[PDB]
Amino acid sequence: RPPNIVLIFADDLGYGDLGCYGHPSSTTPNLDQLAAGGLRFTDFYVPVSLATPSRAALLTGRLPVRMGMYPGVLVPSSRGGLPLEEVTVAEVLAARGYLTGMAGKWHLGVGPEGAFLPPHQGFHRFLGIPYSHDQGPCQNLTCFPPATPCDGGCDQGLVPIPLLANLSVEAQPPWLPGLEARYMAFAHDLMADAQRQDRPFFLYYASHHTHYPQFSGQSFAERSGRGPFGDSLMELDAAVGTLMTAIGDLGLLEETLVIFTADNGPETMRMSRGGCSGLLRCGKGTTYEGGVREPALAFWPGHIAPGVTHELASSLDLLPTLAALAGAPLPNVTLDGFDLSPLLLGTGKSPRQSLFFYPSYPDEVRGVFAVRTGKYKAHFFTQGSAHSDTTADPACHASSSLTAHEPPLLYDLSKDPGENYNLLGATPEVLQALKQLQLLKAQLDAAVTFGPSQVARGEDPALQICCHPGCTPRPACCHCP
Amino acid sequence: RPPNIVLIFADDLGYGDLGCYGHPSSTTPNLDQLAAGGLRFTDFYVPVSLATPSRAALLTGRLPVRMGMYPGVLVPSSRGGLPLEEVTVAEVLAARGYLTGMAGKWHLGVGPEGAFLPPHQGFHRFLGIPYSHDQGPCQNLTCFPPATPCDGGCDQGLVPIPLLANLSVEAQPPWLPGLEARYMAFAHDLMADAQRQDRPFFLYYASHHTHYPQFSGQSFAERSGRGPFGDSLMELDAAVGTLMTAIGDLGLLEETLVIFTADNGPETMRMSRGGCSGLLRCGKGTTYEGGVREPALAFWPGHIAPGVTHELASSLDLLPTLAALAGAPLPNVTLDGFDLSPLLLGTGKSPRQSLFFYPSYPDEVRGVFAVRTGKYKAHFFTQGSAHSDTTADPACHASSSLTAHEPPLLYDLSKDPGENYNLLGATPEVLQALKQLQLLKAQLDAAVTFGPSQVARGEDPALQICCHPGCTPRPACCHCP
Ligand SMILES: *[C@H]1O[C@H](CO)[C@@H](O[C@H]2O[C@H](CO)[C@@H](O)[C@H](O)[C@H]2NC(C)=O)[C@H](O)[C@H]1NC(C)=O
Ligand SMILES: *[C@H]1O[C@H](CO)[C@@H](O[C@H]2O[C@H](CO)[C@@H](O)[C@H](O)[C@H]2NC(C)=O)[C@H](O)[C@H]1NC(C)=O
Ligand SMILES: O=[N+]([O-])c1ccc(O)c(OS(=O)(=O)O)c1
Ligand SMILES: O=[N+]([O-])c1ccc(O)c(OS(=O)(=O)O)c1
Ligand SMILES: [Mg+2]
Ligand SMILES: [Mg+2]
């Protein structure tokens, strides 16, 4: 009975990048087709605009400060990881009998002997890279075949990026023009195996598109008419078209819920090789709408009727909604999301009225940076980020430093989604929205205690995955293409 | 045989305002439905981002400097107007037997005894206001029923806005909450009368939405969830839904070509009561993409198949395309547009490769400000405008004065439609695009001679339309509600 679930999570992709979200040149026909027969959200959100914290929140339904996933993101030498006691969505569904799989980016920790890798967090199967694909040297990697090298080099002084099958290194580094196809093959097998055993499957496809450095297989190199960023988005979109074909071919259309979102807004510091937040302001690394408001699509023919909703939804609501849909029980922990099955099924409204946004570097003295309630969003603190530099808006740059606002900056996102016109720069609707927003911020700051930072437990170069264990010299001996 | 034609032209509406162009809160379901069964253009343009010059170019297929429609816009006391010797599209179709009508904004001149009004330029029927609805006092007008007054007062010291039936004043001023409906009634009658006489009709519906001051009838007041700007856009959209119903009811679906565009980009100086250029830069009054790149839809079931094109098209191409479609002959004048029927019918590509943009205040020493060819756009001069003030981009403000660029600022609009990354800030594709762009600018500047300015022929307060001719005191005695 429980539907099969496929969760596609893109990387560094903005609200204005899909064709269906208005981009003038992107090529995304499969995603456009899913929107046209599915529910397109205009107001869906992640609570923190960086990969690690966002990935933690999506898999646990909890604000990332609760389990220490701050500040910044994890790196290959990190000792820390998402604690093994947090219950992931994967555990929740596995315990109700789903065959569960993950392909692609994890970024939730590696640890001493791979203790934090996915196999330990509820996934039966895993094929991917344990952190972003740019966290290792890439000046010699090919990003576009036959031999266009990746641009800029990526991180130096580290082992090459490992492609892992469960806990074993399959390739180091992998060939980027074919990674995707490896991931579609793995998915195809997970589906079939599950059909075979009469069991519901759960696929978590964390794609590398459209994170720097851009890359694609040869059918897309130079065919999107938006350069490398388009080519990489176009391959992502073709991958979605492949999952939907596989779902067709096994007669699983009406029994599969397919969700598409992305972890955080665009990295505009990659300029024309990064994504686009459309009308929204700034991008990745900030708490402006461009960093935390993502594209989101839900498709389940015969269950979700085609349309557009404006209701509030978050990545935080994913665990509890999917649990409900699977008749799986909720962990016995404080959860920060809700079940949105009534909104999906068209029988109710979203129960979500408020959203809370933390910065990349949060702290317990300042607490939440911004809050949305209804149509009103207040910013109590503002800051730009080097991930959102290079555009003409000075508030997005790294040089717009941390600034306190009291009274907060207050926007009406139904008329001013661009966040340009501070409404306190008076009215009774406004004044009542102000008092609610301040009381929600002070209630959340007083009730959440920050879990001890995983990121500050430090780095140890010995934790890098090495294809040729014990080899020498480290790290360049670690490699098995 | 010739199809019936309905040209809907909106006012001050941006590229990111329709739901189908990505806006998160606008409500435009009829327009979204026309896009879903029609051709949606991602790269359609007007050559000048102000009402008068844009309206002239659309009706004549000629760059507005050729017939003197600069600088700025005409005002109620203007002696000048679009010369009576220019051939409009309306003349062209009337001569092939179309019954032709216009409802709404004209802004192409009034003149001594209404010499420039529409009845003299090929329209058989006319119901509307001869210039924008804000060109007269509005501190006492109702914008939203039952008694919400228009905001800010509009222009002072002038006669109230006249609603005209051909050359006679029907109301002065008209009641804004019902103007629209008057215009749908007139349209409905034009259609029916033409069906009756077995003749093809041509309707030019120049709506007042979404120009300041915003207004709507009671079914839309406060129902769009985007405030007054949404309410006004929502009424516009409901009007489109009414024309399409009338077309249904007379069995004229497959025989009517329906086109939707807008004259110029958004007036962001009205802030949350003005429109949104989406990812594009700046708006009304500039030569950035946000001022000149508009939404555009073409719908003709059984002739135009549903889709999205990225080909180049301009408002300038409208006369010659519609002539071709009607088997009407072209005037014997130099035209600056082309026939895009092959692109509409799906048998050819657009023949347009280049676009030329003039500023609101052009001059023969500086010539064209920007040129697009292929995917490359060069700006030879840049300037902000008080119509595009109040956003965070400093290049859009009135204080960014006229600046020459040599080498020009050069953008790749397929990867950088936001116009952020100057490519000369080297490569052979770039260098060849540069040499083409400079040669196109110098060829057009050398070949176009500016027609003598109509706007500088001056003003005469005696040219104001007065409901009670000879009354006194002028202008406040002029009024007949
Ligand atoms: C590593 O781990 C999983 C689980 O052990 C491997 O398991 C699957 O492999 C085969 C099917 O592909 C079968 O031998 C097993 O039944 C199957 N196990 C389960 C629980 O499904 C898997 O191949 C490896 N991970 C992947 C796909 O890389
Ligand atoms: C004013 O001018 C036109 C043309 O004279 C008027 O003409 C139309 O009015 C009636 C139908 O609505 C008929 O009496 C005429 O046949 C018809 N003329 C043509 C050529 O169609 C019209 O009513 C006035 N304009 C409008 C609609 O306001
Ligand atoms: O924030 N960072 O320091 C950072 C570093 C490397 C990434 O590759 C990255 O992108 S992220 O992993 O998607 O957040 C972010
Ligand atoms: O540019 N102007 O000076 C101007 C004046 C009044 C308008 O109402 C206006 O808007 S316009 O008529 O759409 O261009 C523009
Ligand atoms: Mg990311
Ligand atoms: Mg206008």
Short mmCIF file of C-alpha atoms in Angstrom, two decimals, chain A residues 12-310:
data_model
loop_
_atom_site.label_atom_id
_atom_site.label_comp_id
_atom_site.label_asym_id
_atom_site.label_seq_id
_atom_site.Cartn_x
_atom_site.Cartn_y
_atom_site.Cartn_z
CA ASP A 12 23.08 24.85 -5.32
CA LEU A 13 20.05 25.38 -7.57
CA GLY A 14 18.03 28.56 -7.43
CA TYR A 15 14.41 29.48 -7.47
CA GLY A 16 14.64 31.00 -10.95
CA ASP A 17 16.60 28.20 -12.67
CA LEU A 18 13.84 25.82 -13.92
CA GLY A 19 12.01 26.62 -17.21
CA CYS A 20 8.79 26.31 -15.30
CA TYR A 21 9.96 28.91 -12.71
CA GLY A 22 10.51 31.37 -15.54
CA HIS A 23 14.11 31.04 -16.70
CA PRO A 24 14.48 32.31 -20.29
CA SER A 25 17.20 29.95 -21.52
CA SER A 26 17.44 26.92 -19.24
CA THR A 27 16.38 23.59 -20.89
CA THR A 28 14.44 21.47 -18.32
CA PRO A 29 11.60 19.69 -20.25
CA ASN A 30 11.28 16.67 -17.95
CA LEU A 31 10.98 18.84 -14.84
CA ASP A 32 8.65 21.15 -16.71
CA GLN A 33 6.50 18.11 -17.53
CA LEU A 34 6.43 16.97 -13.94
CA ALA A 35 5.27 20.45 -12.87
CA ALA A 36 2.55 20.48 -15.51
CA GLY A 37 1.05 17.26 -14.05
CA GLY A 38 1.92 17.85 -10.45
CA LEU A 39 1.91 20.31 -7.56
CA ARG A 40 4.36 23.24 -7.97
CA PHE A 41 5.19 25.10 -4.76
CA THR A 42 5.87 28.85 -4.88
CA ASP A 43 6.80 29.15 -1.17
CA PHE A 44 8.85 26.13 -0.15
CA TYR A 45 11.96 26.58 2.00
CA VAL A 46 15.10 25.15 3.61
CA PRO A 47 15.99 26.59 7.03
CA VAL A 48 19.78 27.08 6.43
CA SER A 49 21.40 27.92 3.12
CA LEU A 50 24.43 25.58 3.08
CA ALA A 51 24.68 21.83 2.11
CA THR A 52 25.43 20.10 5.42
CA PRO A 53 22.90 21.80 7.69
CA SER A 54 20.28 21.60 4.92
CA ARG A 55 20.88 17.89 4.28
CA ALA A 56 20.65 17.22 8.04
CA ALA A 57 17.37 19.08 8.38
CA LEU A 58 15.86 17.32 5.38
CA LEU A 59 16.79 13.78 6.63
CA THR A 60 15.82 14.28 10.31
CA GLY A 61 13.03 16.81 10.30
CA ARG A 62 15.01 18.83 12.87
CA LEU A 63 16.58 22.29 12.89
CA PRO A 64 20.30 21.67 12.34
CA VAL A 65 21.42 23.53 15.48
CA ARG A 66 19.73 20.81 17.59
CA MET A 67 22.25 18.12 16.57
CA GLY A 68 25.36 20.27 16.10
CA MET A 69 25.43 20.62 12.31
CA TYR A 70 27.08 24.11 12.31
CA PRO A 71 28.88 26.21 11.67
CA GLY A 72 29.75 25.99 7.95
CA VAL A 73 29.93 22.57 6.18
CA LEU A 74 31.94 19.38 6.94
CA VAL A 75 35.23 18.73 5.08
CA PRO A 76 36.95 15.38 4.18
CA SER A 77 39.16 15.49 7.33
CA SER A 78 36.33 16.24 9.71
CA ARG A 79 36.09 14.11 12.82
CA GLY A 80 32.39 14.97 13.26
CA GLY A 81 29.22 13.89 11.44
CA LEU A 82 25.40 13.73 11.91
CA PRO A 83 25.14 11.80 15.25
CA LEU A 84 24.23 8.12 14.89
CA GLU A 85 21.37 8.58 17.38
CA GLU A 86 19.43 10.99 15.12
CA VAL A 87 16.72 9.00 13.28
CA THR A 88 16.76 9.61 9.57
CA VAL A 89 13.84 9.29 7.22
CA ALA A 90 15.64 6.22 5.82
CA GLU A 91 15.49 4.37 9.19
CA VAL A 92 11.83 5.28 9.60
CA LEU A 93 10.88 3.75 6.28
CA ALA A 94 13.24 0.74 6.52
CA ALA A 95 11.51 -0.24 9.74
CA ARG A 96 8.13 -0.32 7.87
CA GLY A 97 9.72 -2.53 5.30
CA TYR A 98 10.89 -0.21 2.50
CA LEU A 99 13.99 -1.25 0.56
CA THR A 100 15.94 2.05 0.91
CA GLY A 101 18.64 3.47 -1.33
CA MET A 102 20.81 6.58 -1.80
CA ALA A 103 22.87 7.74 -4.80
CA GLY A 104 25.00 10.91 -4.87
CA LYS A 105 26.15 13.54 -2.39
CA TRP A 106 26.02 12.78 1.31
CA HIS A 107 27.97 15.53 3.14
CA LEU A 108 26.76 14.27 6.53
CA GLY A 109 30.13 12.95 7.69
CA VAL A 110 32.65 10.18 7.07
CA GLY A 111 34.37 9.56 10.34
CA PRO A 112 36.69 6.93 11.80
CA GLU A 113 36.14 3.93 9.53
CA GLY A 114 33.13 5.43 7.75
CA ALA A 115 31.09 5.36 10.95
CA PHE A 116 28.87 8.24 9.69
CA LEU A 117 28.48 7.02 6.08
CA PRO A 118 24.95 6.28 4.84
CA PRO A 119 24.93 2.44 5.44
CA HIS A 120 24.93 3.32 9.16
CA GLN A 121 22.00 5.76 8.85
CA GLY A 122 19.32 3.49 7.41
CA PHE A 123 20.14 3.14 3.74
CA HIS A 124 20.31 -0.47 2.50
CA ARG A 125 22.21 0.60 -0.58
CA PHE A 126 24.60 3.49 -1.27
CA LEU A 127 26.50 4.60 -4.38
CA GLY A 128 28.02 8.14 -4.19
CA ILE A 129 30.56 10.67 -2.94
CA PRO A 130 30.62 11.37 0.77
CA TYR A 131 30.87 15.17 0.43
CA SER A 132 30.74 17.76 -2.43
CA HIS A 133 32.48 16.88 -5.65
CA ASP A 134 34.67 19.97 -5.42
CA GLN A 135 36.17 18.94 -2.11
CA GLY A 136 39.39 17.60 -3.75
CA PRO A 137 41.72 18.47 -6.63
CA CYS A 138 40.13 18.76 -10.03
CA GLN A 139 42.67 20.57 -12.14
CA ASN A 140 43.26 17.25 -13.93
CA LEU A 141 39.64 16.03 -13.95
CA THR A 142 37.60 16.13 -17.14
CA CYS A 143 34.29 17.97 -16.60
CA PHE A 144 33.06 17.78 -20.20
CA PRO A 145 34.08 15.05 -22.67
CA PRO A 146 36.15 14.32 -24.43
CA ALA A 147 38.70 16.37 -22.60
CA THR A 148 37.46 19.74 -21.28
CA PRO A 149 38.97 19.97 -17.82
CA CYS A 150 37.04 21.22 -14.76
CA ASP A 151 37.58 24.99 -14.18
CA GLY A 152 39.49 26.38 -11.25
CA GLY A 153 41.08 23.37 -9.52
CA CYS A 154 38.69 22.84 -6.57
CA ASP A 155 40.18 22.10 -3.15
CA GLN A 156 43.93 21.42 -3.02
CA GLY A 157 46.01 19.32 -0.64
CA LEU A 158 43.39 16.63 -0.26
CA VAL A 159 42.78 13.12 -1.55
CA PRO A 160 40.89 12.93 -4.88
CA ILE A 161 37.10 12.51 -4.61
CA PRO A 162 36.08 8.94 -3.82
CA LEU A 163 33.10 7.21 -5.44
CA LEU A 164 31.90 4.70 -2.79
CA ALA A 165 29.72 1.52 -2.97
CA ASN A 166 28.48 1.18 0.55
CA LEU A 167 31.73 1.40 2.51
CA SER A 168 34.12 0.49 -0.29
CA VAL A 169 35.94 2.74 -2.66
CA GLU A 170 34.82 1.95 -6.19
CA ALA A 171 36.93 4.66 -7.98
CA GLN A 172 39.13 7.55 -6.93
CA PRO A 173 38.48 9.69 -8.58
CA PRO A 174 35.48 8.71 -10.66
CA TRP A 175 35.11 9.84 -14.29
CA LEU A 176 32.62 12.82 -14.04
CA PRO A 177 31.14 12.56 -17.57
CA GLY A 178 29.77 9.15 -16.56
CA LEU A 179 28.88 9.41 -12.86
CA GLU A 180 25.25 10.23 -13.57
CA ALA A 181 24.56 7.18 -15.67
CA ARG A 182 26.17 5.06 -12.92
CA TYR A 183 23.60 6.63 -10.61
CA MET A 184 20.64 5.96 -12.96
CA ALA A 185 21.79 2.26 -13.24
CA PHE A 186 21.90 1.88 -9.49
CA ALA A 187 18.41 3.44 -9.21
CA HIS A 188 16.98 1.16 -11.92
CA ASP A 189 18.28 -1.88 -10.03
CA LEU A 190 16.89 -0.64 -6.68
CA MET A 191 13.45 -0.29 -8.21
CA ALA A 192 13.38 -3.68 -9.95
CA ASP A 193 14.82 -5.54 -6.92
CA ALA A 194 12.01 -3.98 -4.80
CA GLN A 195 9.34 -4.84 -7.38
CA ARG A 196 10.81 -8.39 -7.35
CA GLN A 197 10.47 -8.77 -3.53
CA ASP A 198 7.01 -7.16 -3.52
CA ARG A 199 8.31 -4.22 -1.42
CA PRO A 200 7.96 -0.45 -1.53
CA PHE A 201 11.21 1.31 -2.41
CA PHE A 202 12.64 4.67 -1.15
CA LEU A 203 15.21 6.33 -3.46
CA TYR A 204 17.21 9.41 -2.28
CA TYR A 205 18.94 10.78 -5.43
CA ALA A 206 21.22 13.64 -4.15
CA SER A 207 22.57 14.88 -7.51
CA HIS A 208 25.87 16.77 -7.89
CA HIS A 209 24.19 19.14 -10.37
CA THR A 210 24.34 22.04 -10.21
CA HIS A 211 27.28 22.46 -7.87
CA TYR A 212 30.68 23.78 -9.02
CA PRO A 213 32.45 22.55 -10.92
CA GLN A 214 29.90 22.02 -13.61
CA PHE A 215 30.14 18.74 -15.62
CA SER A 216 27.97 16.58 -17.87
CA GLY A 217 28.10 13.49 -20.08
CA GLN A 218 28.55 13.92 -23.84
CA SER A 219 24.88 13.97 -24.79
CA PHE A 220 24.52 17.31 -22.96
CA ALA A 221 27.89 18.96 -23.39
CA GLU A 222 27.12 22.17 -25.22
CA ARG A 223 23.52 21.39 -26.09
CA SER A 224 21.63 23.33 -23.44
CA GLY A 225 21.83 26.88 -24.84
CA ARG A 226 22.94 28.24 -21.39
CA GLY A 227 26.63 27.12 -21.37
CA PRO A 228 28.11 24.79 -18.76
CA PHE A 229 25.55 25.60 -16.06
CA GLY A 230 22.76 24.76 -18.50
CA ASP A 231 24.50 21.55 -19.66
CA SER A 232 24.74 20.38 -16.07
CA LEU A 233 21.12 21.31 -15.37
CA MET A 234 20.02 19.61 -18.57
CA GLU A 235 21.76 16.34 -17.55
CA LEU A 236 20.03 16.59 -14.15
CA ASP A 237 16.71 17.02 -15.95
CA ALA A 238 17.47 14.04 -18.30
CA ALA A 239 18.20 11.95 -15.19
CA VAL A 240 14.72 12.84 -13.90
CA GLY A 241 13.25 11.82 -17.31
CA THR A 242 15.12 8.42 -16.85
CA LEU A 243 13.69 7.74 -13.39
CA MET A 244 10.20 8.52 -14.74
CA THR A 245 10.74 6.07 -17.67
CA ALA A 246 11.95 3.30 -15.39
CA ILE A 247 8.84 4.04 -13.25
CA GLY A 248 6.67 3.81 -16.37
CA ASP A 249 8.23 0.55 -17.62
CA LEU A 250 7.49 -1.25 -14.28
CA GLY A 251 3.87 -0.05 -14.08
CA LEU A 252 4.64 1.95 -10.92
CA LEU A 253 3.35 5.34 -12.05
CA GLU A 254 0.25 5.60 -9.90
CA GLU A 255 2.11 3.99 -6.94
CA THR A 256 5.13 6.30 -6.74
CA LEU A 257 5.32 9.68 -5.00
CA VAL A 258 8.08 11.73 -6.74
CA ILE A 259 9.48 14.82 -5.00
CA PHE A 260 11.97 17.35 -6.44
CA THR A 261 13.65 20.19 -4.47
CA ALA A 262 17.28 21.50 -3.88
CA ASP A 263 19.37 22.08 -0.77
CA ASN A 264 20.09 25.84 -0.97
CA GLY A 265 20.02 28.84 -3.25
CA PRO A 266 22.44 29.65 -6.07
CA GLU A 267 26.19 30.32 -5.80
CA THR A 268 26.33 33.60 -7.73
CA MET A 269 30.03 33.94 -7.03
CA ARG A 270 30.40 31.37 -9.93
CA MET A 271 28.78 34.06 -12.05
CA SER A 272 27.42 32.78 -15.36
CA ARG A 273 28.46 29.27 -14.26
CA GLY A 274 26.16 29.47 -11.22
CA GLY A 275 22.37 29.56 -10.84
CA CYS A 276 19.73 32.29 -10.61
CA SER A 277 17.39 33.23 -7.75
CA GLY A 278 14.96 34.87 -10.26
CA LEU A 279 13.12 37.84 -8.62
CA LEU A 280 14.32 36.89 -5.17
CA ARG A 281 17.24 38.57 -3.42
CA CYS A 282 20.79 37.23 -2.98
CA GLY A 283 21.50 33.53 -2.82
CA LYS A 284 23.46 30.77 -1.19
CA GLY A 285 24.87 31.45 2.19
CA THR A 286 22.32 34.13 3.18
CA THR A 287 18.90 34.23 4.88
CA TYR A 288 17.38 36.40 2.10
CA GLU A 289 14.67 34.58 0.09
CA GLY A 290 17.22 33.76 -2.71
CA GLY A 291 19.23 31.57 -0.38
CA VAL A 292 16.44 29.64 1.38
CA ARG A 293 13.45 29.57 -0.97
CA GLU A 294 13.85 26.65 -3.41
CA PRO A 295 11.99 25.16 -6.35
CA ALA A 296 9.76 22.25 -5.24
CA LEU A 297 7.55 19.78 -7.16
CA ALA A 298 5.47 16.80 -5.99
CA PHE A 299 4.10 14.28 -8.48
CA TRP A 300 1.91 11.21 -7.87
CA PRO A 301 -0.62 10.71 -10.66
CA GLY A 302 -4.09 9.83 -9.52
CA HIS A 303 -3.25 11.17 -6.00
CA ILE A 304 -1.92 14.76 -6.30
CA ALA A 305 -3.88 16.78 -8.77
CA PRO A 306 -2.02 19.24 -10.97
CA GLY A 307 -1.75 22.80 -9.66
CA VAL A 308 0.16 25.55 -7.95
CA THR A 309 0.10 26.10 -4.16
CA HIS A 310 1.27 29.19 -2.25
#
